[PDB]
């Protein structure tokens, strides 16, 4: 199956570029910017201006109205990448204006192929400001008429989850790991010979139209790595305001080491199933973490919840209309 990863605009594009140096395999990636000067650092094999006329290629300074005009005028050229593609994730950080901008115009163009559409979208650092929020939750607003499922992760849980930063360097360095950690997860059961595959039938079943989702990941090592890891799966989730517990539908991926043998699934999904939805519908998959011993972690992207809200620091955030 064919699937493709969009990174678009400048966070989007690093999350992307990560996931390449971090060895995605079997997926096509492509970095998606108004600031041409910014793809030029990338090691993305596929870079793509959009913007040309109404930026002159020196980005959309935060506009988001100018990372939709962007998207529009080069809609040919987004239409053009999006050929011959079962599955595009949709890479942005919420709150500039290309990712802001574009990512709903580039979703909208994708679902509209009949390409399953996940955008993997973030919400700004408190250390960003409160008008980069505001400008991130307006552009979500859109981008979730635009996809099938959108996978929603708030910065400032990130930071939690990992040791201190010294540089803003460090602290997105962290976000683009968490991000590729995110996607390769759902790619490598795919596309990749894993541990255990899933289908990508089942991956559409799972996320179309899924609305607003949220991942945990939780690692667990020695002998009770299944209770540990599915704990602080369902404990970590990297959005608040919408327990895991709640969702529906649910695509879990369990990273093995090499010694670990595959029946290890048994009881994490005797375990998930315990701690979330009696009804949720939940498929697995399960593929090797390189380097690692004894050790298994489990990611949970959770998707088609009673209400699509959330919380954001003290702001409980709900849209106006959920299609
Ligand atoms: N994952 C990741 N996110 C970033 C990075 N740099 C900035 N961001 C986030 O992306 C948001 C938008 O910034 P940016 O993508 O540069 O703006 P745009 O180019 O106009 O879309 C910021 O508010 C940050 O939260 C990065 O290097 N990696």
Redesign the pocket.
Same mark, same amino acid.
């Given at each position: 199956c064919k699937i493709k990863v969009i990174g @678009? %605009? %400048?966070? !989007?594009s690093? /999350?992307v570029n990560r996931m390449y140096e971090d060895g995605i395999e079997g997926v096509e990636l492509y970095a998606i910017?108004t *600031?041409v000067q910014?793809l030029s650092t990338l090691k993305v094999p596929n870079k793509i201006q959009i913007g040309e006329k109404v930026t002159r290629g020196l !980005?959309?300074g935060?506009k988001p109205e100018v =990372?939709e005009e962007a998207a529009l005028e080069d809609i040919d050229k987004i239409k053009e990448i999006l050929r011959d593609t079962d599955m595009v994730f949709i890479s942005?950080?919420? =709150? %500039?204006? +290309? %990712? +802001?901008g574009a990512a709903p115009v580039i979703a909208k163009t994708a679902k509209e192929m009949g390409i399953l559409t996940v955008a993997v979208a +973030?919400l700004? &650092?408190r250390f960003?400001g409160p008008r980069?929020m505001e400008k /991130?939750l307006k552009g979500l607003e859109k981008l979730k008429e635009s996809s099938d499922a959108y996978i929603v992760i708030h910065?400032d849980k990130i930071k939690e989850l990992s040791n201190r930063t010294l540089t803003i360097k460090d602290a &997105?360095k962290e @976000? *683009?790991s968490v991000?590729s950690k995110a996607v390769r997860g759902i790619t490598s059961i795919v596309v990749t010979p894993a541990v255990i595959n899933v289908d990508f039938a089942d991956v559409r079943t799972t996320l179309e139209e899924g609305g607003l989702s949220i991942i945990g990941m939780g690692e667990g090592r020695g002998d009770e790595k299944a209770d540990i890891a599915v704990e602080k799966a369902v404990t970590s989730p990297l959005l608040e305001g919408n327990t895991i517990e709640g969702a529906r539908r649910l695509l879990v991926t369990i990273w093995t080491s090499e010694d670990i043998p595959y029946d290890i699934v048994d009881e994490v999904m005797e375990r998930i199933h315990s701690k979330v939805h009696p009804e949720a519908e939940i498929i697995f998959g399960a593929v090797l973490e390189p380097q690692e011993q004894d050790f298994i972690r489990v990611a949970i992207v959770a998707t088609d919840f009673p209400e699509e809200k959330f919380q954001v620091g003290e702001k409980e955030v709900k849209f106006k209309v959920i299609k």
């Open positions: @678009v %605009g %400048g966070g !989007g690093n /999350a910017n *600031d910014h !980005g959309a935060a =990372g942005a950080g919420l =709150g %500039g204006g +290309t %990712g +802001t +973030t700004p &650092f960003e980069k /991130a910065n &997105f @976000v *683009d991000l």
